[PDB]
């Protein structure tokens, strides 16, 4: 496949961007993919390979190697900086024609510099045996993680382009193998169920849900870079992408790259003494979302070109929470450990299809919403 971009001032930076696939229909076997993105504030590069006929049985072997370097400034560094890289290798086993299992190993390196002091991150750091200040941005951290990844996928829906009956279930999980700096476990389960409502399967009802849980082992916290985020086209639309859930509360501190002409949160050179609540989403260790979509015929399009279009009336529900948030130590501050802060939105959606992939347009308005949540009533994604 094919893409490219650069830029000059979009809010983001230089904006070198690329999505590429080198592939085959038959023969030589390799399936190669490449993603790239360079900004003033990020350098992301992902290289992926897969052999779909690792052996006669049809079993597949897939690996990938990634680099992801984020700098909140450029020229100074000395501000919040998050570099990551790593590798994955996995085996995929078909058994039943409906099913597949997956098992593999992964390694991830994470380097942090000058992270802004906030409660949740620093609860985790304290749990790891690290005690940074909470009064300044002079801190750092560095971890090597090794994980065993597994999964099971069930895909008995009668047709795959535009489903009409049956279910797709996907369970994927991680457990740290001994030797890693972080020690955690994680599970994520996607479920989708299509029930046809007329004999021609032009009206359908889709139920859908995402579940996610995870935690640290033996007294460690789950690494913050593995948190769950909700909101957007993929989960609960009507909200800004990944903004649902716990928000950061910051400790009063001296910011490292300060400028009084700009805006800061609990900066000590703005007069901050107490900790203060913010809009900044930080995700959690637990997540549950659901969605009911009534798929209907298009209210004014003709039927033979409609095989590329789908229309639905939906409502989405969703919540993200942090199990280890201390509801007692921060009495006047909202309980981010409560699961019942369920956001809810409803709207209309149009699952179109570009010649190279399905596209979801949608409008929604969130009606069950909480403070700090950012609304995004008009949504588009691939």
């Amino acid at each position: 496949s094919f893409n490219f971009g650069i830029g000059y001032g979009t809010e983001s930076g230089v904006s070198f961007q690329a999505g590429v696939q080198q592939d085959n229909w038959l023969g030589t076997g390799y399936a190669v993919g490449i993603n790239g993105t360079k900004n003033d504030y990020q350098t992301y590069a992902e290289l992926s390979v897969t052999n779909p006929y690792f052996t006669v049985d049809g079993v597949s072997l897939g690996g990938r190697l990634f680099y992801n370097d984020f700098q909140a400034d450029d020229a100074d560094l000395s501000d919040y900086t998050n570099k990551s890289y790593g590798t994955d290798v996995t085996l995929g086993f078909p058994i039943n024609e409906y099913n597949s299992l997956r098992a593999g190993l992964g390694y991830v390196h994470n380097s942090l510099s000058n992270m802004q002091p906030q409660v949740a991150m620093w609860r985790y750091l304290y749990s790891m045996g690290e005690h940074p200040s909470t009064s300044d941005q002079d801190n750092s951290f560095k971890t090597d993680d090794f994980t065993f990844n597994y999964g099971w996928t069930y895909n008995k829906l009668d047709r795959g382009y535009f489903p009409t009956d049956g279910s797709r279930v996907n369970l994927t999980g991680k457990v740290t193998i001994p030797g890693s700096d972080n020690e955690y476990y994680k599970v994520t389960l996607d479920t989708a169920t299509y029930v046809p409502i007329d004999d021609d399967h032009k009206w359908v009802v889709l139920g859908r849900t995402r579940w996610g849980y995870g935690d640290g082992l033996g007294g460690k916290e789950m690494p913050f870079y593995e948190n769950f985020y909700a909101g957007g086209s993929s989960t609960v639309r009507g909200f800004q992408s990944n903004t649902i859930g716990p928000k950061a509360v910051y400790f009063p501190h001296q910011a490292s790259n300060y400028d009084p002409d700009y805006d800061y949160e609990c900066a000590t050179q703005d007069g901050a003494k107490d900790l203060c609540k913010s809009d900044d989403a930080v995700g959690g260790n637990a997540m549950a979302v659901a969605s009911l979509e009534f798929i209907t015929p298009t209210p004014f399009i003709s039927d033979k070109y409609a095989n590329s279009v789908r229309t639905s009336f939906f409502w989405d529900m969703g919540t993200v929470w942090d199990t280890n948030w201390d509801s007692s130590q921060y009495s006047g501050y909202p309980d981010y450990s409560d699961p019942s802060n369920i956001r809810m939105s409803a709207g209309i959606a149009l699952q179109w299809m570009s010649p190279l992939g399905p596209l979801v347009f949608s409008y929604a308005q969130p009606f069950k919403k909480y403070d700090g949540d950012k609304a995004e009533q008009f949504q588009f994604n691939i």
Partner: peptide, 15 residues
């Protein structure tokens, strides 16, 4: 999210 101040904006980089 990574907060960059000189554009008053929160930048998504975890995905």
């Amino acid at each position: 999210f990574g907060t960059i101040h000189k554009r008053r904006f929160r930048y998504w980089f975890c995905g």
